[PDB]
Structure formats: C-alpha cells, structure tokens
C-alpha cells in the first residue's frame, strides 16, 4: 500500500519515509537509517522510540508496527510526531570510538544537550564550562566532558509500584554499571534511599504480561535468591534493557 511516516531525529529535525503499511520497527528503522546516511557501523547505535511524555520515551519492540503508533498519536497540530530516533547504547567507550564519525557525533551531541536540559545527566557543577563548549560547537570536547557525568547512558523509567515496598514507589535506573532503584512517594517525589544491584547478582528476569510487571530474581551477599516485581507498564522495554546490558557486558573490550 505504501504510506508516509514522519520520525524526529536527535538534531531536532524530522525525516519522512515511504514504507509498507505493515512494516515492523526494524524495517522502518532501516529505511530511516539509509535515508539519513547512517553507515554499517553507525546504524547499530540507534533505534526507534515512542515519545510517551515530556520526560519519557520508550523503545519500540521488534513486533510493533510504527505506522500504527504514528496514526494513533497523530493530530493536525502536535509538534511533529511520536516516533523518534535515539541512541541505544549503554557502554560509553564504544561511542568514544565514534568521535571521528560526523553523523554519530552530531546525533550524540544533540541528544546529550537535550538530556542535560531534561535533568537526566547531572552536569550542574560544570554547567558553565559545558555551556561554553556548547556555544563554540566543540561537539567532541563537549561529549568527552559530559560522558564523565552521572547519568550518562542511564535509562530512567517513570515511577511505579513495587511489590517489595510496603508504601511508596520506585524509579528504576538502568546503566552498564548497575541496576538502581530510587525510593519515592506514590506521587513521584524522591525520598532519599537508593538500592544498587550489581549485574553479577542478577539470576534471572522475566515479564508478566497479565500482571503488567517486570520481574528479576537477585542473590545478594549470602541470602537465598529472591524475586522482585516492578509494576511498570513498560515491562517489555525494561526486559529489553536487561538483555542489552548483558550483551554489552559480554563483549566489553576494555578494562576501564
């Protein structure tokens, strides 16, 4: 049938692609990557996401149909589209290897600036020095500095209920270094406690479609393995994050 799809890019522009109506996310993604000029190396570093809210975007699963999501969230107004291209990478050294690829650097740079604006990357103490690199468009230098801040390449999920808290919610934060749960109220106001699970402690993990839950079983210190249920509507994205983190850990090619 062939239909139109608009997708937002990290530099704040959008691209339009013609695709078959029933294209799945990877087919749309490859059509976009070719159109914007990604090569065989760079294409592995980005993915298709849906804008859920101002503060959260969720990765499209392989069995989704991006045209369905597009039409369903479409209006005559709406600043663009709910589909967006974002980086999909937890290991920051792999992206340092791309400092000589203009496309990658540009996309990494624009998404990082927006991720600072939104609070994901805690860059406050060097806000001025980053701002002058931003002003001079010293993109690699800006990124080389920013990659040393807290929250670079961390996925933060919206607060939700957890079966291992009597009262209150958790905000989960997934990075290459560990899986973190931040305690907060049922409103989403940060309490002040943080549990940090090492990936080595992770025994198994799973989803519960019926119960709308992501589950993980951890073994800590010396105690018996235990299951924790996080009641997030984004259990499939969370599950994809675990799969991706262990993949990047196996293929880690650096001691630092």
């Amino acid at each position: 049938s062939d239909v139109e799809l608009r997708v937002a890019l990290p530099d704040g522009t959008t691209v339009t692609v013609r695709v078959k109506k029933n294209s799945t996310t990877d087919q749309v993604y490859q059509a976009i990557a070719a159109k914007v000029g990604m090569d065989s190396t760079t294409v592995n570093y980005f993915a298709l996401f849906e804008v859920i809210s101002h503060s959260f975007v969720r990765k499209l699963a392989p069995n989704e149909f991006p045209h369905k999501l597009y039409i369903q969230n479409y209006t005559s107004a709406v600043p663009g589209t709910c589909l967006t291209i974002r980086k999909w990478l937890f290991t920051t050294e792999e992206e340092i290897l791309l400092n000589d690829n203009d496309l990658a650097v540009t996309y990494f740079f624009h998404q990082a600036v927006d991720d600072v604006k939104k609070g994901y990357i805690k860059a406050e103490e060097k806000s001025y020095q980053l701002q002058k690199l931003y002003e001079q468009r010293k993109m690699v230098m800006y990124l080389n500095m920013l990659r040393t801040c807290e929250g670079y390449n961390e996925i933060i999920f919206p607060h939700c209920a957890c079966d291992s808290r009597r009262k209150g919610h958790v905000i989960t934060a997934i990075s290459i270094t560990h899986f973190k749960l931040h305690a907060c109220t049922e409103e989403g106001q940060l309490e002040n406690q943080v549990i940090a699970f090492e990936w080595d402690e992770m025994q198994r993990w799973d989803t519960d479609e019926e119960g709308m839950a992501f589950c993980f079983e951890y073994a800590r210190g010396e105690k018996k393995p235990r299951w924790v249920k996080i009641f997030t509507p984004y259990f499939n994205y969370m599950h994809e994050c675990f799969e991706r983190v262990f993949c990047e850990l196996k293929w880690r090619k650096e001691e630092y």
């Binding site: 291992s164 808290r165 209150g168 958790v170 749960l181």
Partner: peptide
C-alpha cells in the same frame, strides 16, 4: 520484607 521490604528491600527498602
């Protein structure tokens, strides 16, 4: 119970 609570891990928190």
């Amino acid at each position: 119970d609570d891990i928190f």
